[PDB]
């Protein structure tokens, strides 16, 4: 495991890297798909009689 | 608005309104009971009036009367907006309970005659989806205008 991956033995202590996520979301950015959903409602409300 | 035109009193042996090659005279007005009592048709006659519509007048009258630039993107701030979405739910609920009351009732002795002699024109679908349509369209217009300004303004 030392040659392939990390887990490198130092002073009697291994070291595993952090494999978590750090994504800084804002989520008002997908506001186009929301307006897309609002329009396709009133599309489907109207347009067929 | 109506205009009129006097006929002479010498044409007493001939029928008045000497129409010859026209068939539009049955249109544009027929002589009502309040018109043919005073002088029609024995004194004067009626005349047709159309409207001289053209370009350089019509679109510029509409674009200055029924037109708003800054108003089409306002937000009608939500103190009274979500307040308006509350007084309508209660009366719709009572109509729904009244709609509940008739649907569970279901008179099934001579139904088609009882339905036609007892109409109300407010219970089944008159007061049921009218306000529901109005509350649906308003928040859609309001939220879509709210979403667009968030797309535009940063």
UniProtKB/Swiss-Prot annotation, chain A:
Q: Which residues of the full protein are shown?
A: 302 to 350 of 350
In its UniProt entry, what is this protein called?
A: 26S proteasome non-ATPase regulatory subunit 8
What is this protein's function?
A: Component of the 26S proteasome, a multiprotein complex involved in the ATP-dependent degradation of ubiquitinated proteins. This complex plays a key role in the maintenance of protein homeostasis by removing misfolded or damaged proteins, which could impair cellular functions, and by removing proteins whose functions are no longer required. Therefore, the proteasome participates in numerous cellular processes, including cell cycle progression, apoptosis, or DNA damage repair.
Instruction: Summarize subunit and interaction data from the UniProt record for this chain.
Output: Component of the 19S proteasome regulatory particle complex. The 26S proteasome consists of a 20S core particle (CP) and two 19S regulatory subunits (RP). The regulatory particle is made of a lid composed of 9 subunits including PSMD8, a base containing 6 ATPases and few additional components. Interacts with DDI2. Interacts with TASOR.
**Similarity field:** Belongs to the proteasome subunit S14 family.
Q: Which gene encodes it?
A: PSMD8
Curated annotation (Swiss-Prot), chain B:
Phosphoserine: residues carrying this PTM: 68
Where does the entry say this protein is expressed, by tissue? Widely expressed. Highest levels in heart and skeletal muscle.
Query: Its GO biological process terms?
Result: double-strand break repair via homologous recombination; double-strand break repair via nonhomologous end joining; proteasome-mediated ubiquitin-dependent protein catabolic process; protein deubiquitination; protein K63-linked deubiquitination; regulation of proteasomal protein catabolic process; response to ethanol; ubiquitin-dependent protein catabolic process
| One MF annotation (Gene Ontology) recorded for this entry | proteasome binding
Q: Which UniProt keywords apply?
A: DNA damage, DNA repair, Hydrolase, Metal-binding, Metalloprotease, Phosphoprotein, Protease, Proteasome, Ubl conjugation pathway, Zinc
Instruction: Give an example GO cellular component term for this record.
Output: secretory granule lumen
Query: How does it associate, per the subunit comment?
Result: Component of the 19S proteasome regulatory particle complex. The 26S proteasome consists of a 20S core particle (CP) and two 19S regulatory subunits (RP). The regulatory particle is made of a lid composed of 9 subunits including PSMD4, a base containing 6 ATPases and few additional components. Within the complex, PSMD4 interacts with subunit PSMD7 through their respective MPN domain. Interacts with TXNL1.
What is the purpose of this protein? Component of the 26S proteasome, a multiprotein complex involved in the ATP-dependent degradation of ubiquitinated proteins. This complex plays a key role in the maintenance of protein homeostasis by removing misfolded or damaged proteins, which could impair cellular functions, and by removing proteins whose functions are no longer required. Therefore, the proteasome participates in numerous cellular processes, including cell cycle progression, apoptosis, or DNA damage repair.
Family, similarity comment: Belongs to the peptidase M67A family. PSMD14 subfamily.
For this entry, the protein name equals: 26S proteasome non-ATPase regulatory subunit 14
Classification from the root reads: Eukaryota, Metazoa, Chordata, Craniata, Vertebrata
């Amino acid at each position: 495991y030392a040659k392939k991956r990390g887990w490198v033995l130092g002073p009697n202590n291994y070291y595993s890297f952090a494999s978590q996520q750090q994504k800084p979301e804002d989520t008002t950015i997908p506001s186009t798909e929301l307006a897309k959903q609002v329009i396709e409602y009133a599309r489907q409300l109207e347009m067929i009689v | 608005i109506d205009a009129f035109r006097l006929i002479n009193a010498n044409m007493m042996v001939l029928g008045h309104e000497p129409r010859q090659t026209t068939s539009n005279l049955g249109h544009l007005n027929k002589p009502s009971i309040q018109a043919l009592i005073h002088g029609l048709n024995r004194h004067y006659y009626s005349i047709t009036i159309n409207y001289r519509k053209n370009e350089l007048e019509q679109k510029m009258l509409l674009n200055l009367h029924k037109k708003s630039w800054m108003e089409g993107l306002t937000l009608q701030d939500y103190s009274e907006h979500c307040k308006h979405n509350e007084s309508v739910v209660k009366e719709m609920l009572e109509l729904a309970k009244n709609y509940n009351k008739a649907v569970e009732e279901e008179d099934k002795m001579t139904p088609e005659q009882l339905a036609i002699k007892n109409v109300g024109k407010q219970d089944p679908k008159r007061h049921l989806e009218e306000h529901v349509d109005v509350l649906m369209t308003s928040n859609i217009v309001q939220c879509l205008a709210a979403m667009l300004d968030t797309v535009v303004f940063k």
